[PDB]
């Protein structure tokens, strides 16, 4: 795990580790949140608040002492801290040892929403994913399938019901692009797309409620760079089954 999901809590020796293995962020039993290099050299810390402490990803990364007070915080500079942001924001620790907080807004959906769904669980489909006939994803009682015929379809599994579909007949592939657009293709012809080309890479969220959203990463803060007012271009990191969030990396200088 190189990341923290929204609301995720770490404590009592729990940690995350950069993709390359070199950096480790650990919430120690003594209540000190520490960044280690090569498992032996502490390069940054909050300093300890004592036992019974925890750190939690809730828009900010916040460190709580046993008395429930906030002893350290990322202190991300936003103007409006909507309590629905706390279920959306996640954290990556990257290969140069910097760590950063993302809160991404949806840019496209298979359906327009009245209001967020509560306790929805998302299957991340990351940047550079190339779907191909026979590709499918299962999340709960819903199936997302790129089919032989080229249709991208969401099915309710039980009972079988079509919930949504692109009707892109003949398409050969579907691509979650680095430019921020999700596009379905016959050869080089775009049959369908999400109109989300922004130069910021895309990922998809397929829900256990039978819906599909495209978001793009919005880096808000890093330990080394403090709060950011504009979001810098990031690059997709290595996404596998162990990771519950998108994975990103961001450059050293500008
Ligand atoms: O983002 C909301 C909607 O916008 C429309 O133009 C279409 O592209 C739909 O596919 C989408 O559900
Ligand atoms: O990403 C490939 C696979 O990942 C697993 O979680 C599930 O979503 C599968 O349905 C999917 O085929
Ligand atoms: O309406 C959705 C249906 O569309 C049809 O054209 C086919 O692609 C089916 O596989 C799919 O279930
Ligand atoms: O061709 C562009 C496509 O973009 C989609 O998001 C919708 O607007 C489709 O109805 C359309 O076919
Ligand atoms: O309209 C379809 C096209 O939109 C473009 O701006 C890019 O994202 C292309 O990759 C995509 O094929």
Residue numbers in the entry: 2 to 255
Task: Provide passages from the article that reported this PDB entry.
Titration of pyocin L1 into d-rhamnose gave rise to weakly saturable heats of binding that are significantly larger than the heats observed on titration of pyocin L1 into an identical concentration of d-mannose. From this experiment an apparent Kd of 5–10 mM was estimated for the interaction of pyocin L1 with d-rhamnose with apparently weaker binding for d-mannose, Kd>50 mM. In an attempt to determine the location of the pyocin L1 d-rhamnose binding site(s) and the structural basis of the d-rhamnose specificity of pyocin L1 we determined the X-ray structures of pyocin L1 with bound d-mannose, d-rhamnose and in the unbound form. Electron density maps, derived from both d-mannose and d-rhamnose soaked crystals show clear density for sugar moieties in both sites, C1 and C2. The sugars refined well in these densities at full occupancy, giving B-factors comparable to the surrounding protein side chains. The canonical MMBL hydrogen bonds observed for both d-mannose and d-rhamnose were the same: Gln to O3, Asp to O2, Asn to O2 and Tyr to O4. In addition, O6 of d-mannose forms a hydrogen bond with Tyr169 in C1 and His194 in C2. The fact that d-mannose forms an additional hydrogen bond is counter-intuitive given that pyocin L1 has a significantly stronger affinity for d-rhamnose, however Val154, Val163 and Ala166 of C1 and Val184 and Ala191 of C2 form a hydrophobic pocket to accommodate the C6-methyl group of d-rhamnose. Weak density was observed for both sugars at site N1, however given the high concentrations used in the soak and the overall low binding affinity of pyocin L1 for monomeric sugars, it is unlikely that N1 represents a primary binding site for d-rhamnose.
